[PDB]
Amino acid sequence: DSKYQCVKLNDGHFMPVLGFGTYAPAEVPKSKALEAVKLAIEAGFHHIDSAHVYNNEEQVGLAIRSKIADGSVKREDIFYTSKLWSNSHRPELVRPALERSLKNLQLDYVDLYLIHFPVSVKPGEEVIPKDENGKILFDTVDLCATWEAMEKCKDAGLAKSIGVSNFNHRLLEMILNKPGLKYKPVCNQVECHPYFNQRKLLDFCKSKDIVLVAYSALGSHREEPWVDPNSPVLLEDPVLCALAKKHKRTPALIALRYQLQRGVVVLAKSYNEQRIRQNVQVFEFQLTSEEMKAIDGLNRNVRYLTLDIFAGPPNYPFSDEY
Amino acid sequence: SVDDSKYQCVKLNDGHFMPVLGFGTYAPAEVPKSKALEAVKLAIEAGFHHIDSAHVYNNEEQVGLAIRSKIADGSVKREDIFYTSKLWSNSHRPELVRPALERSLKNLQLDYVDLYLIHFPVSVKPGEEVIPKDENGKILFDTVDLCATWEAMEKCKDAGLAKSIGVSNFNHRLLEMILNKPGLKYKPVCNQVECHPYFNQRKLLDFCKSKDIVLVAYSALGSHREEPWVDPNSPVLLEDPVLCALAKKHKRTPALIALRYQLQRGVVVLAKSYNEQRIRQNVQVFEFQLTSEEMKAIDGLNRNVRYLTLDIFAGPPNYPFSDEY
Ligand SMILES: NC(=O)c1ccc[n+]([C@@H]2O[C@H](COP(=O)([O-])OP(=O)(O)OC[C@H]3O[C@@H](n4cnc5c(N)ncnc54)[C@H](OP(=O)(O)O)[C@@H]3O)[C@@H](O)[C@H]2O)c1
Numbered sequence A: 001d002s003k004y005q006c007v008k009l010n011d012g013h014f015m016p017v018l019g020f021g022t023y024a025p026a027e028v029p030k031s032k033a034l035e036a037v038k039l040a041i042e043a044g045f046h047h048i049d050s051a052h053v054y055n056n057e058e059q060v061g062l063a064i065r066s067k068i069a070d071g072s073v074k075r076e077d078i079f080y081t082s083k084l085w086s087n088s089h090r091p092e093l094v095r096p097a098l099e100r101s102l103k104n105l106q107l108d109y110v111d112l113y114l115i116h117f118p119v120s121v122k123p124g125e126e127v128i129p130k131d132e133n134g135k136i137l138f139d140t141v142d143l144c145a146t147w148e149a150m151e152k153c154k155d156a157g158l159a160k161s162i163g164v165s166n167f168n169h170r171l172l173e174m175i176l177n178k179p180g181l182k183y184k185p186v187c188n189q190v191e192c193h194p195y196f197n198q199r200k201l202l203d204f205c206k207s208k209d210i211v212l213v214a215y216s217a218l219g220s221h222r223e224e225p226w227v228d229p230n231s232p233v234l235l236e237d238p239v240l241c242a243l244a245k246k247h248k249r250t251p252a253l254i255a256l257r258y259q260l261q262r263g264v265v266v267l268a269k270s271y272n273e274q275r276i277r278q279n280v281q282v283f284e285f286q287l288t289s290e291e292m293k294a295i296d297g298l299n300r301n302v303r304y305l306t307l308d309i310f311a312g313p314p315n316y317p318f319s320d321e322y
Numbered sequence B: 001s002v003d004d005s006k007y008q009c010v011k012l013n014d015g016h017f018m019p020v021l022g023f024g025t026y027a028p029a030e031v032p033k034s035k036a037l038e039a040v041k042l043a044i045e046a047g048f049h050h051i052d053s054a055h056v057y058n059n060e061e062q063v064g065l066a067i068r069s070k071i072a073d074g075s076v077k078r079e080d081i082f083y084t085s086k087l088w089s090n091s092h093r094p095e096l097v098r099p100a101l102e103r104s105l106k107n108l109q110l111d112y113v114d115l116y117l118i119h120f121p122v123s124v125k126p127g128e129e130v131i132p133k134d135e136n137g138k139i140l141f142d143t144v145d146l147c148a149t150w151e152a153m154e155k156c157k158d159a160g161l162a163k164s165i166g167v168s169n170f171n172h173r174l175l176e177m178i179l180n181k182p183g184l185k186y187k188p189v190c191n192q193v194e195c196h197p198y199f200n201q202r203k204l205l206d207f208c209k210s211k212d213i214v215l216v217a218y219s220a221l222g223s224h225r226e227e228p229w230v231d232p233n234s235p236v237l238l239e240d241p242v243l244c245a246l247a248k249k250h251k252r253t254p255a256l257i258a259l260r261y262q263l264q265r266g267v268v269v270l271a272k273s274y275n276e277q278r279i280r281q282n283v284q285v286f287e288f289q290l291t292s293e294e295m296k297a298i299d300g301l302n303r304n305v306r307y308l309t310l311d312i313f314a315g316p317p318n319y320p321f322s323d324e325y
């Protein structure tokens, strides 16, 4: 213990390369996140991924603080990520959103704060506000101004590092090229897996030393109406299953190891005590270059999470090629 | 930012972690041994957490002092230094393995090495001389079962003298030999071998990976080019045009490109320098990354150029470089 695999971010901080996802569908009791985070820590996860919009920060924080006070882990050995929801993109709303997250977590800082999604919605308690016609109440906010507000939260010490999520090439360039930029995003957390392996965006991120963090790396939560139930089940893939047999591992383990070997930090959500343990075994084997090539072949350009309910605004990120 | 107790490491097949950038400590004979002391100190100061040495480099006293010095002054803790030594070929006989380790520890004044390797698979006769020769200058080769040598290595690990054990300059056959040994207790955590864009070890790399063995690259910058070890007609790796082009593009150096290349193919890479500026420059390998096209462009430099043949040890069956890999 005490040591684990991390990568150096562009602001000098280190991020553990395997992250534990904490989102769980609405039907799942928020209490299950409490135990799942505790187990994840016990199993050796050192990186925990959440967001204000997952509505579990109370529980996630309790787990962390609970594996701390029981000396199972130290605060410096937990990399905790939160995310700014789209109803707080206005500059004067960013620090208050982070501070509310921190109050819920009862923590002094987050290790990483991301702009969760580049499209903005009307400020208020409702995370997906809708009008009388059932249409989204979008808002217009200069992301450059939101990013300047994140830089101030990092300078205030409330976030160790800042980054973004669901940003495309155009949106990343907007930040990277912003006049007077103080801090580049350390990461861009996006959907990534053998069926949507983000090779183009990945390479771009690499060229600017931005770490691409893969979510729904195991084929996603497949929650409706977010993900089409007709979409292929990743973990049933014939090639993944074959490689899983060869290595005597599982298709999940193969999908995770794949991301590690291509330079991607990978998240993995499970609320199963035993699967939580399985996933940490990603550090127990390697894939050969022929095998990597085989997984590369699986790419289909199928995106599980379109979030197309947010389509329309200029900053909707998935219309571009990448 | 956080020159903290955080840095990039990989998990070894025995549960231990190895920092992925190692500092090489061998310097040609014309270089005074004293220089190794200041070099390793500067390397620790710069952020190297992995230090590579060997009995045959005749600097363990200096390298050990450097490490002790940086611990005793509070710059670093012992658990944050990954120190590697190597068993020289005059101590391949099983009963001589632990005595060899203990002697290196005595010279270093350390309690344990983080990693102890079988340095080279060809054995020579026991005694003080590292390359024992008879009166006619013939090297005095010895016949030793490396499987027995490995058993003695396993015992060194069970004793806590070495946290991990591995090999160096082993080929496919020799690896299989160890891995397929009856009663095998500990697999080698690594195979430290020459590796660089002119000799990228693709095949051997895949093999190691398939066994979860970490390939550690030595002479990753094109070697010390010391004669008569290295053919002075050999190409200068760091003068390669492609490397130079990439270096220019990234605003880095050919050396940085060469090291980053290894990191991105899952290879732990060593880098030797006794120059304060280059020592600091090399840890910059964590500051950028290469695209898949750039990686492919480096893969294209492979030219089967082995800088270090060690062919004075060619002849005996265990000579490792005759086989395809
Ligand atoms: N920033 C964003 O826009 C965004 C979007 C989506 C997700 N995320 C983050 O990424 C995390 C992961 O994404 P996800 O939650 O969408 O999908 P995921 O991690 O792809 O989900 C994998 C599904 O596989 C199951 N699983 C886990 N380990 C397994 C194993 N070893 N073998 C077989 N099945 C296994 C899990 O079910 P069990 O619990 O029953 O094991 C889970 O439902 C989320 O929790 C969240 O933190 C971020």
Ligand SMILES: NC(=O)c1ccc[n+]([C@@H]2O[C@H](COP(=O)([O-])OP(=O)(O)OC[C@H]3O[C@@H](n4cnc5c(N)ncnc54)[C@H](OP(=O)(O)O)[C@@H]3O)[C@@H](O)[C@H]2O)c1
Pocket (backbone or CB within 6 Å): B023, B024, B025, B026, B027, B052, B053, B119, B168, B169, B192, B193, B217, B218, B219, B220, B221, B222, B223, B224, B225, B238, B253, B255, B256, B270, B271, B272, B273, B274, B275, B278, B279, B281, B282, B308
């Ligand atoms: N196990 C084995 O059989 C074996 C064999 C050979 C080597 N090794 C290990 O691997 C280490 C490295 O191998 P090496 O010593 O053969 O080769 P190396 O690390 O490839 O040597 C690089 C040469 O490049 C120079 N250099 C370092 N950084 C540079 C930079 N940033 N820009 C330009 N030049 C730079 C150094 O000279 P300056 O010092 O002047 O900077 C050095 O002489 C050794 O010290 C040793 O620990 C092991």
